[PDB]
Symmetry: D2
Subunit: 127 residues, 4 copies
C-alpha cells in the first residue's frame, strides 16, 4: 500500500516484553540503522514502543531494500526509569533483510535485568 516512509503493510515490526513484570515493555526507544556502502551504520528509522509494547510504521516496502540492519533496543534507560540497574547498555539485532525477495520481519524481545532473548519471525508477503 503506502510507499516511501511510514506504516504500509509493516515489513518490519518490533515487540518488547518485560520478564520481571509480565507485561509489555512500554515506551522503549528503538533505533534502526542500515549498513551503508562505506560500511558505517546509517540511521534508517526510530520509534518508541506503545501501550501494547509494539512498534509499527517504522518503514515501507519500497524503502526496506536488501541490506544488513541493526535494531537497537535501548533497554537500559527502560530499567533505570524503573529504578533497577541493568547489565547491558542495550540490545541489538543484526541481520540481512530482503536478499531473496521482500519479507516481513517481526523482531520480538523478552527483557530482564541481567538477561535477554530475541526472536525473529519472518513471513512471505501475503494479502
Amino acid at each position: 500500500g503506502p510507499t516511501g516512509t511510514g506504516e504500509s503493510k509493516c515489513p518490519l515490526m518490533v515487540k518488547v516484553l518485560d520478564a520481571v513484570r509480565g507485561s509489555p515493555a512500554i515506551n522503549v526507544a528503538v533505533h534502526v540503522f542500515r549498513k551503508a556502502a562505506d560500511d558505517t551504520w546509517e540511521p534508517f528509522a526510530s520509534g518508541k514502543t506503545s501501550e501494547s509494547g509494539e512498534l509499527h510504521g517504522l518503514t515501507t516496502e519500497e524503502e526496506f531494500v536488501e541490506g544488513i540492519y541493526k535494531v537497537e533496543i535501548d533497554t537500559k534507560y527502560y530499567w533505570k526509569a524503573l529504578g533497577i540497574s541493568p547489565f547491558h547498555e542495550h540490545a541489538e539485532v543484526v541481520f540481512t533483510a530482503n536478499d531473496s525477495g521482500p519479507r516481513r520481519y517481526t523482531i520480538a524481545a523478552l527483557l530482564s535485568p541481567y538477561s535477554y532473548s530475541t526472536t525473529a519471525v519472518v513471513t512471505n508477503p501475503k494479502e
Copy 2:
C-alpha cells in the same frame, strides 16, 4: 460477553513460536488442566495452534475461576513430525489464576529441540 464455554474476551490465550524456523509453531496440541479439590488434575480445556500459532477460545470468564492450572504444550510430537528428535516430552506451565479478581493471561512459548522458554503476560480486564 459469552459466558460458560468458548471464546468471549479471551481470559486465557496461548502462543507458540518456532526458534529453529523463525515461524509460528502451527498445529501444536495444548492441554489445560485445573487443580481439583482432591488434588489430582482435571481436564479444563484443549486445542491446537492455528496458522498464526495462537490458541483462542479455550474458556470463558465465568468458567475460569480461581485455582491452579497447568498448560501442557505437546512439543514432542511437534518436532517429531518435523523429523527432529527433541529432548523434553512436553512443556507445562503451572500457576495460580484469578486469586485477586479476574485477569487475562497470555502464555507465550518459544520452542527449540533441546531448550524452551515460557513467558506470561497478564492484564486487568479492560474494555
Copy 3:
C-alpha cells in the same frame, strides 16, 4: 563409588540461574521423579542448589536407567524470599533419560518473576 545416590560420575546435574540479580540461585529446592509402572511419579532424588547454583550427585550410573524423569525446581518460594511475587508455582522439566547410554545430562534453568527458560546439555562422559 560413591555411586548409588551421589556425585561419583554425575549422570544428571541441575543448574539454576537468577536473571533478575545476575547471580546463581542458591537454595532452590529441586525434586527429581521417575515415571513408574502405573504411570505415576515416584520420588527419585532431591536436594537444594549450592552457592554456585549447581546441584550435584543426584543419582548414579547404576541407578539411573532408561525412562521418563521429571525435574521439578521450586521457584515460587525462591522468589518469595526475595520479596517478589512470581507467576509460576514452579518449573518442571519432563524428559526420557538414558536412551542409548547413561551419558551426562545437565539441566539448565534461567528464572525471572514471569519467565523461565530451560536447557538440557547432554554430553559424552570420559574421565
Copy 4:
C-alpha cells in the same frame, strides 16, 4: 600471572551453547572490544570456544579496567558449518565492565537459527 591476556584469574569468561543439538558450541569465534576515547571499538581480545563451549583467559585483572566492552560472538558461520541458514549476522553483548570491582563476568549465550538468549553471571571472586 599468567595475567595480561590469559586465564590467571579470569575476570571475563564466555559460554556458548547450542539449543538445536543440545550441546556446547565448539569453535565459535568471539571478539571482545573496548569502547575508546573517540567513541569507537578498539580490539581487546578474541579466541574460539573450546569443546566444552567455554572461552577462558581473555584479559586479566590488571588490564581489565572500568569501561564499555563488547562481546561479539560469530554465530552465522557457526550455523553455516552445520548446514543451517541462521537469521542473525552475529550476537553481541554491550556492557559496562568493572564498576566497583574486577569481579568475575560470565557471558552466557544460547543459540538457535532464529534466536539467541544471553545472560551475564557476575559473581564475587575468592580463590
